[model samples]
Target: GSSGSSGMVNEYKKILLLKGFELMDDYHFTSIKSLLAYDLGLTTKMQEEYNRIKITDLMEKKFQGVACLDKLIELAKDMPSLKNLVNNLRKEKSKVASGPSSG
Candidate 1:
């Protein structure tokens, strides 16, 4: 809504980051996997369900793009620190139904 866009995972992430989310902190991320090794083939699900990302890199506008809801959901689950924001996103997603099916 801030960007006049809806159901965008990146927008949600950005908001959370600004809200003091510890997504880039030292210890929390060690439990998550890096994006460079991201696997969507279900095999990785048994292990690291979500991939880690550089919060600094994500702060850049160029890196802010959400490809799909499933991916967004995955990230939401992995980052427990952003649960509140993710819930807000879900509400926004319903309003942005024009919208969220694909992204």
Candidate 2:
């Protein structure tokens, strides 16, 4: 396990803006939802489970800010478009945990 302090609130906000509701091709809600549901485990299909759900709607009741955030970051490794979103979040999170920049 890493020794970094986990701060998820800021990351959550960044994700909502950067991943789901943005105006980019890869950042659109349906696309990201498909990636989450089809390629990754961020969400599940009705046939795959008891019910069908979108990550946005899935998060409506389940998002307490931290749980799905980890799931998204974990799944992001396999997604090229999302990899940098994770990297940015990780870098910013780590920056908060460490010393200030010299330059």
Candidate 3:
């Protein structure tokens, strides 16, 4: 059922995974290692809503943009592991386009 969701979760998961891979390539092992842990929390929250409300409903709702990223970065400032993870993800994404890639 949740698979029917508007693809946000899947897209987010892909982006996160890519970032983790990039971090690993850059030899940022600690940051790469934190990706799964951080992603688990974020995805859990997203899936909780999906279970309660259909993915269509969730997609139909207006979502704030990168504000969540900003908030997460701000919140992680004091958390060394999470902060590094978020920072690496942000840095990796900064060089890419907004949408998903075929590669």
Candidate 4:
């Protein structure tokens, strides 16, 4: 269940753009934590707080926004391959939880 699906994230803040927010500040956060945080926030805003996450999920090439993404990965972490799955999703980040594009 390591699906943040490993797509490239950069320039014009590609990840954020993919999630539908723009970065106007021309600031590219060199820190992955910061970058990931920002990406999740914008994406997070788009989520509907589930009283329960829908029963089924899978690895598909889709941006399930913020909330659902990490919840899925966390569901898998108890296993060996997935125990370290969170790191790869950051590769896959466990979201507890962005802006304009630069020219």
Give the candidate number with the greatest lDDT: 2
Question: Least accurate stretch of 10 residues (summed lDDT) in model 3?
Answer: 51-60
Q: State the lDDT of candidate 2 residue by residue for 1-103, as single tens digits.
A: 7867876544555554455334234343445566655534554354235222334446434555554555556655566766665776556556545588878
User: Model 1, range 1-103, lDDT digits (tens) per residue?
Assistant: 4577566455545543443234344444433334412533223453354333343233333334443333444555667675654665555546545654655
* Residues 1-103, model 3: lDDT tens digits: 5365464454433444344333333233333223422633335455434331232222223223443334334544555545565776576446444776558
- Estimate the TM-score of every prediction: 0.32, 0.43, 0.33, 0.25
In candidate 1, stretches whose alpha carbon ends up further than 4 angstroms from where it belongs are: 1-29, 32-72, 78-82, 98-103
Candidate 4 has a TM-score of: 0.25
Candidate number achieving the greatest TM-score relative to the actual structure: 2
Q: Candidate order by TM-score, highest to lowest?
A: 2, 3, 1, 4
- Quick one: ranking by lDDT, best first? 2, 1, 3, 4
Pairs of colliding residues, candidate 4: 22-99, 22-100, 22-101, 23-99, 23-100, 23-101, 24-100, 88-91, 88-92, 89-92
Name the runs in model 3 displaced over 4 angstroms: 1-63, 97-103
lDDT of 4 by residue, 1-103 (tens): 8786674532212322322112211122122223333434423322333111111121112335554445444444454443333454444232322333445
